[PDB]
Design a protein around this ligand. Structure first.
Ligand SMILES: [Cl-]
Lengths: 297, 299
């Protein structure tokens, strides 16, 4: 079952690029090598963290090729696919497969609000485009699309769709959400989470995957936390999670993407800034990030 | 001739942009739509809005569309063009393209993936506004962005010298008069405040709205203009009478989204063979039939 490759810690690096959107493949390569060396379960490139929607088809392809040449099929490489048009999403999926991705992550990016049925047909078309397994990128924040349970059931029954990145339920009722969904979705479907500040509780509650922003930059401490959570070691996991709380606070206040760019600059892992119109943090805010990193190290 | 706000007033008609499955604009069908708008004497032609699928067309096809509209109009009617992009640099380039291709005005939406701060939206608008000599309208369409302009941000933007208008969504409580009374004193003098959401725009205009950014007018400009003129003249009962002829269409817009309905209507009227850009899908068999009935009711 291709669901297996979606499990565990999936690390989402930034995609360093200049002001014109040209990917800095040297810096990107350094980030990938760092993740391979740390032995994350998968590398999720071109997610929201990796600014896929702010890069051209060609620059996305360049990033995937570079990551594939490094990982050499020895660590799962997942690539963000999204586009406003179905035909572009299909093309991007085919590109990712040809460039060496092992898995696809599909967000229902929208302009004109889509019906549940329209989202279904879009997913089916992209799923049919390649032999790769696909995860549903369920992120109403960025996509402005909300999956009904009914739609999730339909999608979980498309042959190569084997996983979902869920948002944190407003509830923090991860156990309740998993108890509701698992019986409804296809057997062994991988149900995971993003929103780093809730992911240890989500994993302790039974979540299959942490789609992790912090891991894309600091894979080592993120791995230690994830392993404790996966083992159901709640005492240890909660202690380790507390070390990240200063970083979590910053994620919640400012959005993880702005914080992670600031952190990457502090660690000399990038000189890039977010793609405009996204703007970086203030000097005082960057200082808070520096202090948050100190708490971890 | 003093204030560029004046070109944004009245009926701004938003045609579809006919295009094949690959996103190649059908310039022949588009040309006829533009010509029909000019013949009906609409106040402005608003191409490449959400109705005109601007976000589903390439920079090159968008330019082709603007060039064609300018070619047909030859400066006889104000041409406004939608110019949004996720990236500031692409939005800037689209604006420059539009000016070079013969647009008279620009319409700018805060297209988002990663949610933007109020300040981030400000700098994006300022960069685009600074990129050309054209006036710009703020495209306040939160259903396509989930970006809420705070009143503070509207004040900031309305002070950008060449931003002279805004397309507001319908207020949730339908208090047009209250909204206008709050905004007019805070925004720059003579700022043109208009509305979209066709089923609410007769009321909005009667309450004092400056512009109807109109979906139905892009296809059926003659009855839409009759309606707008009655509302503008303060002929409230005539306006309401005319508004009621559109009510079958209004109900379909509200249920299914105006874009899907207007594509159905354009096909029914033999003005396009195009379908919405996938993943947007057309209406059902029975639903198209309701559109046909709505058009008969109108005609
Ligand atoms: Cl325990």
């Amino acid at each position: 079952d291709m669901a297996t490759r979606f499990k565990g810690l999936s690390a989402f690096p930034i995609t360093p690029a200049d002001e014109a959107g040209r990917v800095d493949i040297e810096a990107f390569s350094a980030l990938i090598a760092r993740l391979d060396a740390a032995e994350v379960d998968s590398v999720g490139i071109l997610g929201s963290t990796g600014i896929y929607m702010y890069l051209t088809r060609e620059e996305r392809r360049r990033a995937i090729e570079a990551a594939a040449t490094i990982l050499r099929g020895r660590r799962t490489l997942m690539a963000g696919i999204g586009a406003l048009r179905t035909d572009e999403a299909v093309a991007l999926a085919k590109d990712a497969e040809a460039a060496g991705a092992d898995a696809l992550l599909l967000a229902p990016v929208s302009y004109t609000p889509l019906t549940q049925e329209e989202a279904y047909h879009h997913f089916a078309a992209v799923a049919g485009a390649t032999a790769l397994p696909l995860a549903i990128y369920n992120n109403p924040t960025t996509t402005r699309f909300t999956f009904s349970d009914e739609l999730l059931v339909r999608l979980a029954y498309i042959p190569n769709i084997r996983a979902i990145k869920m948002p944190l339920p407003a509830d923090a009722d991860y156990a309740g959400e998993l108890a509701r969904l698992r019986p409804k979705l296809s057997d062994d479907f991988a149900i995971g989470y993003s929103g780093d500040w809730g992911c240890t509780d989500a994993t302790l509650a039974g979540g299959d995957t942490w789609y992790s922003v912090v891991a894309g930059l600091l894979p080592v401490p993120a791995l230690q936390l994830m392993r404790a959570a996966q083992a159901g070691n709640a005492e240890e996991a909660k202690r380790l999670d507390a070390t990240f709380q200063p970083l979590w606070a910053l994620f919640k206040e400012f959005g993880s993407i702005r914080v992670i760019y600031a952190a990457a600059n502090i660690l000399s892992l990038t000189v890039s800034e977010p793609p405009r119109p996204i703007l970086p943090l203030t000097s005082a805010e960057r200082q808070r990030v520096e202090e948050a990193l100190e708490a971890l190290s």
